């Protein structure tokens, strides 16, 4: 039903939500996330949204190289060699991220949860 689709997924560990597909619904209201980093967990349907992409105007977080963590405004969306693409604003700049390098803290994704939630 839900098998298959790119969502945003809680890592229960640091409450953030990253990007990763449903594989396998594996009963107990729980799925298996298979992350884009090829880390995989089941999570509860509760902390799992079902934006792809996230959508324009939303306050994400960017990784960078380093793994700092940046708050921004997504502003474009892009398509690269079957990719997906984000561009970031902060402070006026807007920055290209990979789809795996934007991410939403515990109250970025909680804010998402009414609309995107599978809950
Ligand atoms: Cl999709 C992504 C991108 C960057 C960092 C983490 C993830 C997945 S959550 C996780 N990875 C390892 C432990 N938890």
Redesign the pocket.
């Given at each position: 039903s839900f098998v298959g689709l790119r969502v945003v997924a809680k890592?229960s560990?640091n409450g953030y939500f990253?990007?990763?597909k449903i594989t396998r619904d594996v009963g107990a209201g729980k799925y298996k996330l298979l992350?884009?980093?090829g880390?995989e967990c089941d999570v509860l349907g509760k902390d799992i949204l079902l934006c792809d992409p996230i959508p324009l105007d939303t306050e994400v977080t960017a990784?960078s190289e380093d793994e700092y963590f940046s708050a921004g405004v997504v502003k474009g969306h892009r398509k690269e060699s079957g990719e997906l693409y984000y561009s970031i604003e902060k402070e006026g700049q807007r920055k290209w991220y990979k789809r795996?390098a934007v991410i939403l803290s515990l109250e970025q994704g909680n804010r998402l949860r009414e609309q995107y939630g599978l809950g």
């Open positions: 890592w560990s990253y990007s990763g992350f884009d980093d880390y990784l795996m």
